[PDB]
């Protein structure tokens, strides 16, 4: 037996595909997410954009909250670590958190260096806006990617921008002449071997979810239509008049993302 292998870390992300991961702040919300059909929950203490709205420092969640969430559900539980914060990440790992989000929406602990995610056993998801950034996160040991999008707005535009950019860059790398790839690598800031493997595989080696801006069922379907492997959705689900109903509609829109009659009913 061997734990913590690349295939195992990425495998867990592969098993998340076609699903919705929901931000939750307590066990009551976590239960609603599971019962709605969420594939994982992201345990938060407070909504990070609000902490920073109030100008404060947004850090790892109180492990008490993460535990309450873990014990409330049987689906995977993710949590966020500040960028570069080795000990916050190790603590979450020690707690058995299923996936760590080395997250830009928390206050970066290290503004020059990201975590050496290769040395951990628990896998990490990281944000990206283009293929260069994507490949740098992967080389550091990211096992899953998401769009950075635009947190705290509900404007799908930046998720759209990042998904489209990464996807377009991948299509070009796959189609381009191999002897032109070093110049491309250099222009993108991408590790060359990764880029070459992308061309050979015809795809990114890791799953890439949409995040930051999904506010409606149409948005979630849109992101799947644009090539997302799945969708992260925020706390606004629970600001709704009927969180259960809203959560379910997001899950169904994400699954049946070309069923427009259905999506029309879900959008009401």
């Amino acid at each position: 037996a061997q734990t913590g292998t690349e295939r195992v870390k990425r495998g867990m992300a592969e098993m998340q595909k076609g699903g919705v991961i929901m931000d939750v702040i307590n066990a009551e919300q976590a239960k609603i997410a599971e019962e709605a059909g969420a594939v994982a929950v992201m345990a938060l203490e407070r909504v990070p954009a609000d902490i920073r709205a109030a100008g404060g420092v947004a850090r790892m969640a109180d492990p008490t909250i993460v535990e309450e969430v873990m014990n409330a559900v049987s689906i995977p539980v993710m949590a966020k670590a500040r960028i570069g914060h080795i000990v916050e990440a190790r603590v979450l790992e020690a707690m058995g958190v299923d996936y760590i989000d080395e997250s830009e929406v928390l206050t970066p602990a290290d503004e020059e260096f990201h975590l050496n995610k290769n040395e951990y056993t628990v896998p990490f998801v990281c944000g990206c806006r283009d293929l260069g950034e994507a490949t740098r996160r992967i080389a550091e040991g990211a096992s899953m990617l998401r769009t950075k999008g635009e947190p705290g707005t509900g404007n799908i535009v930046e998720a759209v921008r990042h998904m489209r950019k990464v996807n377009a860059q991948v299509r070009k790398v796959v189609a381009m002449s191999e002897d032109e790839l070093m110049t491309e690598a250099k222009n993108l800031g991408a590790p060359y071997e990764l880029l070459l493997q992308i061309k050979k595989d015809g795809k990114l080696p890791v799953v890439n979810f949409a995040a930051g801006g999904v506010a409606t069922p149409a948005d979630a379907a849109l992101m799947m239509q644009l090539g997302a492997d799945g969708v992260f959705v925020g706390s606004g689900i629970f600001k709704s008049d009927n969180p259960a109903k809203f959560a379910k509609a997001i899950v169904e829109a994400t699954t049946h993302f070309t069923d427009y009659k259905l999506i029309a009913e879900l959008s009401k």
């Binding site: 037996a1 061997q2 734990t3 913590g4 292998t5 295939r7 195992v8 495998g11 867990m12 592969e14 098993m15 998340q16 595909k17 076609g18 699903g19 599971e34 019962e35 709605a36 059909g37 969420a38 594939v39 994982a40 049987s74 689906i75 995977p76 790992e93 058995g96 958190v97 299923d98 996936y99 056993t121 628990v122 896998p123 379910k248 899950v251 169904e252 699954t255 049946h256």
Partner: protein
Amino acid sequence: MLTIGVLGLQGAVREHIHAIEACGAAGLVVKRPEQLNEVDGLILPGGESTTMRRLIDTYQFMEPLREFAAQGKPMFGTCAGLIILAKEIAGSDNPHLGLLNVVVERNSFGRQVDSFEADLTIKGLDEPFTGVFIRAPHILEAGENVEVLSEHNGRIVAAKQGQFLGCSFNPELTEDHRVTQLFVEMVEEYKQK
């Protein structure tokens, strides 16, 4: 020429389709019950059994799936899918399809940090096979109508019952298609019958 479906509500669906095709069958992603009428067998993929059940319920897949099974069409569950197939789930009074005569315990190795690879000896496989166990369950017991194909440290991890194949690991996460081939042969055998 064979057609094997993969239940497409959620999970590692593409992986299973790739493996089906690598064995020389046609893969069809199944998202609507009516599509069951179009395939010779079905794969229930890895993912979240919770999610799949919720979606199964919502799009009224349970009866269709039972009728599919009632028709003799083979069915293959991998991890989440094994959970959907199982007769009993430890600690739950709300089982799923219930077609495979096993009692399964979910999330029995711990959490993702505990997910592992281990080489398995599988009945009808020559060389060992790398089981990739992602938040896997185990099969606590199997009934008498069930054939044990593999065990890992004295626990059942793969099983067959006539038209039903089930395992706790995800073979579709490897480039070794031999377990998928076992299932393809099961479907080819039903497609002579």
